[PDB]
DNA sequence: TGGCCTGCAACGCGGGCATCCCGATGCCGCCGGAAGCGAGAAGAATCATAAGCCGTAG
């Protein structure tokens, strides 16, 4: 549900590509932080296979 | 293929023995230098105290 309980939001997306490993992100929490380099799609598919 | 180790035989010189002359040396007495590291001082490696940007939030 949305902020006022009037709409619906999908929890996760039915994706086919691991965008976390392909592009990544760089965010910082209140006490934590993360940083992930991008990668190549073909080698990720090869590793998954 | 060329050179080296060794046996056989001939030659020579020095090991051993003693001693006379000799050179170091242990000891004694007097003098020199270096060590003694402890301490003062200087240089350097390391630790402690500000920003700049990475991207959403106010």
Task: With beta carbons less than 8 A apart as the criterion, state whether A39 and A48 touch.
Answer: no
Report the alpha-carbon distance of residue A30 to residue A16 in Å, rounded: 31
Task: With beta carbons less than 8 A apart as the criterion, state whether A34 and A27 touch.
Answer: yes
Resolution in Å, one decimal, please.
6.6
Q: Is the dihedral of CA A2, A9, A11, A34 positive or negative?
A: negative
| Distance, Å, A6 CA → B3 C1' | 112
Helix (H, G, I), strand (E, B) or coil at A47: helix
* Among A22, A20, A12, A13, residue whose Cα is nearest residue A45: A22
| Distance, Å, A13 CA → B10 C1' | 115
Query: Which residue is listed with tokens 């910082």?
Result: A28
Chain A 3-32 residues whose Cβ is under 7 Å from strand B: 26-28
Nucleotide nearest to A35 (CA to C1'): B54
Report the alpha-carbon distance of residue A43 to residue A37 in Å, rounded: 14
Report the alpha-carbon distance of residue A29 to residue A43 in Å, rounded: 30
The residues with which A28 forms a beta bridge, in sequence order, are A33
Report the alpha-carbon distance of residue A43 to residue A6 in Å, rounded: 43
Q: How was this structure determined?
A: cryo-EM
């Amino acid at each position: 549900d949305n902020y006022d309980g009037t709409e619906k939001i999908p929890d996760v997306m039915p994706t086919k590509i691991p965008n976390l490993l392909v592009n990544g992100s760089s965010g910082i929490a209140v006490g934590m932080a993360t940083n992930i380099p991008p990668h190549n799609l073909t080698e990720v598919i090869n590793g998954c296979l």
